[PDB]
Structures are given as structure tokens and as C-alpha cells.
mmCIF file of C-alpha atoms in Angstrom:
data_model
loop_
_atom_site.group_PDB
_atom_site.id
_atom_site.type_symbol
_atom_site.label_atom_id
_atom_site.label_comp_id
_atom_site.label_asym_id
_atom_site.label_seq_id
_atom_site.Cartn_x
_atom_site.Cartn_y
_atom_site.Cartn_z
ATOM 1 C CA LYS A 1 108.030 137.374 130.626
ATOM 2 C CA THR A 2 110.847 134.791 131.154
ATOM 3 C CA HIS A 3 109.455 134.116 134.700
ATOM 4 C CA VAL A 4 105.898 133.813 136.091
ATOM 5 C CA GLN A 5 104.814 133.967 139.777
ATOM 6 C CA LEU A 6 102.675 130.870 140.519
ATOM 7 C CA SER A 7 101.031 129.532 143.718
ATOM 8 C CA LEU A 8 100.961 125.699 143.288
ATOM 9 C CA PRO A 9 98.453 123.556 145.252
ATOM 10 C CA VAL A 10 100.411 120.913 147.243
ATOM 11 C CA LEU A 11 98.553 117.534 146.953
ATOM 12 C CA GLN A 12 98.869 114.348 149.069
ATOM 13 C CA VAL A 13 100.138 111.558 146.716
ATOM 14 C CA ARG A 14 97.162 109.259 147.631
ATOM 15 C CA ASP A 15 94.625 112.005 146.560
ATOM 16 C CA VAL A 16 96.117 112.443 143.092
ATOM 17 C CA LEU A 17 93.716 111.205 140.360
ATOM 18 C CA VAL A 18 95.989 111.744 137.311
ATOM 19 C CA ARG A 19 99.441 110.562 138.343
ATOM 20 C CA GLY A 20 101.501 112.009 135.455
ATOM 21 C CA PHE A 21 101.513 114.182 132.335
ATOM 22 C CA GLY A 22 102.104 111.531 129.625
ATOM 23 C CA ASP A 23 104.378 108.978 128.083
ATOM 24 C CA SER A 24 107.623 110.682 126.859
ATOM 25 C CA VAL A 25 110.097 113.159 128.451
ATOM 26 C CA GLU A 26 109.151 115.725 125.759
ATOM 27 C CA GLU A 27 105.356 115.221 126.289
ATOM 28 C CA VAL A 28 105.507 115.486 130.110
ATOM 29 C CA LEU A 29 107.605 118.729 130.013
ATOM 30 C CA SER A 30 105.175 120.127 127.352
ATOM 31 C CA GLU A 31 102.038 119.137 129.320
ATOM 32 C CA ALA A 32 103.568 120.380 132.637
ATOM 33 C CA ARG A 33 104.227 123.821 131.044
ATOM 34 C CA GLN A 34 100.686 123.918 129.561
ATOM 35 C CA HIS A 35 99.079 123.041 133.005
ATOM 36 C CA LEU A 36 101.293 125.625 134.830
ATOM 37 C CA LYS A 37 100.153 128.320 132.326
ATOM 38 C CA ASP A 38 96.421 127.201 132.648
ATOM 39 C CA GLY A 39 96.581 127.000 136.509
ATOM 40 C CA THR A 40 95.749 123.239 136.435
ATOM 41 C CA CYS A 41 99.098 121.983 137.916
ATOM 42 C CA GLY A 42 99.637 120.535 141.415
ATOM 43 C CA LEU A 43 102.809 119.739 143.376
ATOM 44 C CA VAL A 44 103.562 116.551 145.365
ATOM 45 C CA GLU A 45 106.381 116.808 147.941
ATOM 46 C CA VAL A 46 108.847 113.934 147.443
ATOM 47 C CA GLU A 47 109.424 111.568 150.392
ATOM 48 C CA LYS A 48 110.104 107.818 150.801
ATOM 49 C CA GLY A 49 107.455 105.896 148.812
ATOM 50 C CA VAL A 50 105.998 108.868 146.854
ATOM 51 C CA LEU A 51 107.620 108.414 143.397
ATOM 52 C CA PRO A 52 106.686 104.678 142.959
ATOM 53 C CA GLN A 53 103.012 105.835 143.454
ATOM 54 C CA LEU A 54 103.301 108.245 140.459
ATOM 55 C CA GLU A 55 103.762 107.572 136.728
ATOM 56 C CA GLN A 56 107.051 108.041 134.805
ATOM 57 C CA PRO A 57 108.269 110.080 133.119
ATOM 58 C CA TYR A 58 108.335 112.430 136.203
ATOM 59 C CA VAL A 59 108.439 116.256 135.973
ATOM 60 C CA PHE A 60 110.282 117.883 138.926
ATOM 61 C CA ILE A 61 110.464 121.531 139.974
ATOM 62 C CA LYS A 62 114.048 122.231 141.112
ATOM 63 C CA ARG A 63 115.454 125.404 142.801
ATOM 64 C CA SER A 64 117.296 127.399 140.043
ATOM 65 C CA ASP A 65 118.766 130.113 142.381
ATOM 66 C CA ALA A 66 119.290 131.087 146.126
ATOM 67 C CA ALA A 67 113.428 134.259 146.282
ATOM 68 C CA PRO A 68 111.610 137.329 144.859
ATOM 69 C CA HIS A 69 108.407 138.337 146.785
ATOM 70 C CA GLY A 70 108.464 134.948 148.715
ATOM 71 C CA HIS A 71 108.546 132.984 145.363
ATOM 72 C CA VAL A 72 111.442 130.440 145.062
ATOM 73 C CA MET A 73 112.875 130.477 141.500
ATOM 74 C CA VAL A 74 112.439 127.011 139.938
ATOM 75 C CA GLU A 75 112.869 125.223 136.618
ATOM 76 C CA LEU A 76 111.538 121.936 135.159
ATOM 77 C CA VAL A 77 113.631 118.708 134.978
ATOM 78 C CA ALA A 78 112.083 115.429 133.680
ATOM 79 C CA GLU A 79 113.201 111.894 134.701
ATOM 80 C CA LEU A 80 112.643 108.522 132.892
ATOM 81 C CA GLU A 81 114.282 105.216 134.046
ATOM 82 C CA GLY A 82 116.854 107.079 136.188
ATOM 83 C CA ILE A 83 117.967 109.609 133.512
ATOM 84 C CA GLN A 84 117.170 113.362 134.014
ATOM 85 C CA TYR A 85 116.681 115.875 131.191
ATOM 86 C CA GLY A 86 117.927 119.116 132.613
ATOM 87 C CA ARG A 87 120.294 120.064 135.397
ATOM 88 C CA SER A 88 119.143 122.225 138.352
ATOM 89 C CA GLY A 89 119.122 122.501 142.184
ATOM 90 C CA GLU A 90 117.180 120.801 145.008
ATOM 91 C CA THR A 91 113.755 119.227 144.200
ATOM 92 C CA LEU A 92 110.750 121.171 145.639
ATOM 93 C CA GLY A 93 108.461 118.353 144.396
ATOM 94 C CA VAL A 94 106.956 116.434 141.459
ATOM 95 C CA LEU A 95 104.330 118.124 139.258
ATOM 96 C CA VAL A 96 101.008 116.415 138.460
ATOM 97 C CA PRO A 97 97.778 117.530 136.809
ATOM 98 C CA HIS A 98 95.346 119.159 139.250
ATOM 99 C CA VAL A 99 91.713 118.102 138.635
ATOM 100 C CA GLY A 100 90.120 119.517 141.860
ATOM 101 C CA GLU A 101 91.945 117.568 144.636
ATOM 102 C CA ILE A 102 91.934 119.542 147.951
ATOM 103 C CA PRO A 103 95.466 120.791 148.724
ATOM 104 C CA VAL A 104 97.246 120.712 152.125
ATOM 105 C CA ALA A 105 99.293 123.880 151.318
ATOM 106 C CA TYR A 106 100.390 126.233 148.527
ATOM 107 C CA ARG A 107 104.018 126.557 147.299
ATOM 108 C CA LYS A 108 104.862 130.057 145.859
ATOM 109 C CA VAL A 109 107.371 129.670 142.968
ATOM 110 C CA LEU A 110 108.824 131.894 140.230
ATOM 111 C CA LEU A 111 108.851 129.574 137.170
ATOM 112 C CA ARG A 112 111.448 130.026 134.400
ATOM 113 C CA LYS A 113 109.041 129.740 131.370
#
């Protein structure tokens, strides 16, 4: 399938133990996709002061369309030193590894895989 229905645990930035996916744009997009497939991916909602608390490169989920079965269609865009790799809509949040942090909510998305 080109798209997969996921329910992503929404984490508070100060709970996150592993604050990024790796060290290159290509690695973080790779690792993000692997963690989404394995159900080991969390979502941090972006507000003032959140991104400086996480590690670059960043992996964002961005709205790809204007919502089958309650699931917003999203795609991955990475960012390193102010340059983005991909072009998409509004940010729903920044992806991070999930290693058992307690979420505050779940975000239903349809991920272009």
C-alpha cells in the first residue's frame, strides 16, 4: 500500500529520551520510516522553544492533502540548518523515536509510504 493508517503517540518534548533519528537528512528520513513501520515512532507538537530542545536533522510530518476515516494524510520532510528536503503542507509535528514515554494524546495520520 502507498498509504498506511497510523495512530502516533504525542509526547511532551521534555519527556523525550531519544531526541532525533540520526546525523544526516537521508539517515533521519530512513530511520523515521523504519520506526513508523515498527510502531516505535512518536510525535512532538511544534511550539515556541520545542525545536531547540530536539536534535537536527529534524523529521516533520506535514499535511499532504485537505482526511480518510479521521486520518490526516501526511508526508515526511527533513530539515538541517534551515534547509528542508521535501515540499508539503502545514506541520503536524516533529517525529522522534518512541522508547516507552507516556503520551498526552494520539494523532491519527495516513502516511504516504
